[PDB]
Design a protein around this ligand. Structure first.
Ligand SMILES: [Cl-]
Lengths: 52, 52
């Protein structure tokens, strides 16, 4: 797996939540994607409260 | 998020699903992440009927 690139992407997406100014619908789907990606690539960026 | 980058990211994730050597749990999470990113950013790569 390309763990470092995936981790870069996870950090980028986390930042989109906080600094990206996305729509609420996009935000909901993005939150889920981030949680799923952290499981997929076995790496996290700490954030309460993303549930997973 | 810029659509060009969203597209490239989702293409990378699709490639990791098929070539990343991820565990079964991780693969499932990745498939769902792809659905979520397609929805979040308004571009399609896998275009699963499962995407909500
Ligand atoms: Cl496929």
């Amino acid at each position: 797996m390309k763990k470092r690139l995936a981790y870069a992407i996870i950090q980028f997406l986390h930042d989109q939540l906080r600094h990206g100014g996305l729509s609420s619908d996009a935000q909901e789907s993005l939150e889920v994607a981030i949680q799923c990606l952290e499981t997929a690539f076995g790496v996290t960026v700490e954030d309460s409260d993303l549930a997973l």
